[model samples]
Target: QTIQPGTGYNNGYFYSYWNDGHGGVTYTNGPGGQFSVNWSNSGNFVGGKGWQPGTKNKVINFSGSYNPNGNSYLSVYGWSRNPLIEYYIVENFGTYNPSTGATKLGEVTSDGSVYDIYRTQRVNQPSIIGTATFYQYWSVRRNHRSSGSVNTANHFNAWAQQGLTLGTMDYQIVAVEGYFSSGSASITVS
Candidate 1:
């Protein structure tokens, strides 16, 4: 398990997280098949696969799978660093729901998957600086899934197509935000 304030890779992609208040994600190979992750959180975090920003229509994609354990909201989430709004498509592994502090804002489909959307006000959350950064949160929820891949970048276009305004791109990333969890997950990424 490799967790740090710097950068690391799992299955050949650069991944990172805001190491504030004891939160980080690590990837390892399963004994038989697939790769797995062991992650935990005390209060806040942003950890996972990240990419340099591009046009909102660029169709940045990710293909993978996951098996979550323990009581945490394991999610496939993204962030736009400049204006700082996050988008989450989550799978509730246990009793985790991504809609706690967010407002349900209808649903949209992008690249064959449907997501129930949400948004949050200016609230203090973790960022790269290992401190709190206030920004809006936009999330899309779906039923818990076990196997799938997604074009994460195209979600902004999907959101905009649904009449939701957006911001300039900075950096976009995919990660799992663990809240009050000491759990592990199995995953394979491409």
Candidate 2:
């Protein structure tokens, strides 16, 4: 079933969510933890599955086909409460890299690749809770790939080592995001 742009909606083991601006986006839930998304001329559209409240230690395995015509990203994206933080374990991207012009904290080797850690802030922007200011933690891989396993704890520990600690866990998922561009991705997370 195709779901139009909206807020979070339950779909068994996973939930679908999207903020499809200007452009249009569609999400389709598949069996188990599988899901697909398609967007065109999107002005910052992000959509994917939300397995459940995330944890500090967990291994997320994912496999999928990602094809984008412009700027896009495939990432393990999520948020946290208390201190309120948004984090991304960027696996792959298209056209443009999302780490450009951010504060590069350091790097960490995980999942057989090196990832550059970065920290940025969003002032009074949209968030899981609501419009508020928050910090964004990023681990952009030096080498990008479509399918792989993400050691969530590894990245979390790495960020903490860099003094970018996270608060209470929130929903985490493998997401496909596009910015003022067009793209499509079908991913399965477990």
Candidate 3:
């Protein structure tokens, strides 16, 4: 069944979604940090599950099936306070690679693949801490895949190596996101 579009806790994980009202999404939370989402004609939609007050170091094991018919992304997404940052560890994407125009900092090899690291700034934009200015850190994989083990600490340490340090951790999740497009995903996280 589809729940309201917002943040909620279920099956021991936190889930959230947002859209520009140009389209819609249907979401269902399954057992044990599992969930699925089907979105259509949406103007920016993202949903997934993971922990609140995310840990700074840990291994995130995930398996999922993602089919995005338009511009979309499958990623480990989250936020941080103090310095206020948004981050993504993209596993897969459709139509467009998110790192296309961002300032490429460097790259790192993790979980048997290479990912290009990037940093972008958002000025007075909406964030977990409300409308504010913040930075976005990205680790976009060179190869796209649907399922794998994400060593969260690896990415965190990699960013720090680039002088892209994060602040206090916030909600983190394996997210399926679409921008002005449509897609679906079924993911289980642990």
Candidate 4:
């Protein structure tokens, strides 16, 4: 998959201990238990959890260049519990106000299908400096784990993350993160 260091898209992967996957952020253990992220003042981040694990368990901030001219775009991937690969494209860009708080999390499935998004404009939202950087995380919980599907081998688990944007513009990308997994197993035969 492609991973970056807040500059552009690169090739890398993350490994972690997100056994049951991600759902709620915990105070301890979680890959991104209580980490902090920085972004432009006018940016909003929804998902992109640090619980990276391409079957490995490391974290990689993957990002790709804009349209070269000025087009904000992010290519993120997450693991699902089904051994079947899923794709997502968070196209259809939108805007948010910083004075209120984070851009408010939004997400679609790999198939571009619609799903529930996060939007919080409460008074207690994290404060910002010049350019507030919103933060969020995505996790993958095995689907088959509950159904018991580990025969032909399953790869990838549940996946999620927040789309990032700088202010009201579509060219200033800040960071990159996503899901990548080949399913989880107790142990395998080589």
Candidate 5:
């Protein structure tokens, strides 16, 4: 089967903005854990004073290296946030197509004193197995102000848009985790 592009093709877009009213952002660690994108029903497109279902739209987590380089990029080629809660988190791969900045399935790993590797491809055009649209998840992150800041609001976001390529792969359920601590940033996969 082939995949197409759109909300129905992939899964659904999960959007969230920081709210000081959220009490505190939820957190997960190590590996298999629960990450989330809090929900708000009222979008600028939709008008509603109190949008219902103001909780979580999708439930995501980590399946590989928890703390990805905030600067490094991540792309999900076969992601889905629909049907159930499978494929919520992952280390989808693809080479960074220079012309379009997406392809080759995953990224290469380099020797590190601290970290082993980081995501290099952004989720611009990640293709799904049976569809063109993959649940686009930008939960990967990096830190600009040392470590311990604890939010993308204070750090750098991953690149936008991506292409497709070969050698793309996901980390072993073992090699992947929840988060990594470098300077002052914690790249959460939520």
Candidate 6:
């Protein structure tokens, strides 16, 4: 499906924003873990969001791949109230900085990829939530891959062990995202 141009959630299942819509394509969850998308765009911010119906302490079993040009990422994303959790099982991050200017705490070796953990906050971050300075963890892949599976909640647990306080999960999103100048990408998750 093609997301036009706007900001805020649409159809109670998707959220997107774009500077320019040279072309439009967002991740569509196919039957089971088989999904894909293809197109081009000068700029777009596309993804989906919803709570994964559980507490923050559970292993999320999933896998996927993304082939993109310009800029895009296929990831499991989410948010909370007091603090925000921005976790990504990135398929492709294009030219954009994956760290998003956060301080790199360290790295965690996972099943499929090594995660370069980063720390950031909501101060100056553009989001539906007003600026709340708290911990934001980015467990990014060290080696690029079209697809792989890692026990995602394990990473969050590690951080919690390290004193990174996280609030209750408000939403969970598995999405193929594009930023600034972009193209298209696809995702498959179980």
- For candidate 5, the lDDT comes to 0.22
lDDT of 3 by residue, 1-190 (tens): 4676788888778888776666667778889889998888877877888988789886888998999998999999999988899999999999999888899998999998999999999899998878998899999998888899999899999899989999889899999888877888899999
Runs in model 6 lying further than 4 Å from the true structure? 1-23, 26-29, 33-35, 48-51, 54-58, 61-64, 89-91, 128-134
What lDDT is obtained when candidate 2 is compared to the true structure?
0.84
TM-score of each: 0.68, 0.93, 0.96, 0.19, 0.18, 0.72
Tens digit of per-residue lDDT, candidate 1, span 1-190 = 5445455544555555554555445545432223455765444444556454534554434435544444455455555654556555564455656566667667766545677777665546555334555454454545556455555555665566656566665545455555655566554444
lDDT per residue as tens, model 4, 6-43:
32212221222221233221111112211222222212
Q: lDDT order of candidates, best first?
A: 3, 2, 6, 1, 4, 5
Q: Which parts of model 5 have CA positions greater than 4 angstroms off?
A: 1-78, 81-129, 144-190
Error of 5 at 2 (Å): 31
Clashing residue pairs in candidate 6, if any?
A: 50-172
lDDT by residue (5-40, candidate 6, tens digit) is 453443344343333444555444345434455556
Instruction: Please tell me which predicted candidate would have the highest TM-score against the true structure.
Output: 3
Instruction: Compare candidates 1 and 5 on TM-score and give the better one.
Output: 1
Give one digit per residue, the lDDT tens place, for model 5 in 143-170: 2111121221111111122221112222
Query: Which portions of model 1 miss their true places by more than 4 Å?
Result: 8-12, 21-35, 39-45, 58-71, 91-93, 111-113, 124-137
Which parts of model 2 are misplaced by more than 4 Å?
A: 6-11
Q: Name every residue pair that clashes in candidate 2.
A: none
How well does candidate 3 score on lDDT at residue 34? 90
Give lDDT per model, in order: 0.54, 0.84, 0.88, 0.23, 0.22, 0.58
Query: Candidate 4 — what's its lDDT?
Result: 0.23
Model 4 residue 15 distance off true place after TM-score fit, in angstroms: 17
**Model 1 TM-score on a 0 to 1 scale:** 0.68
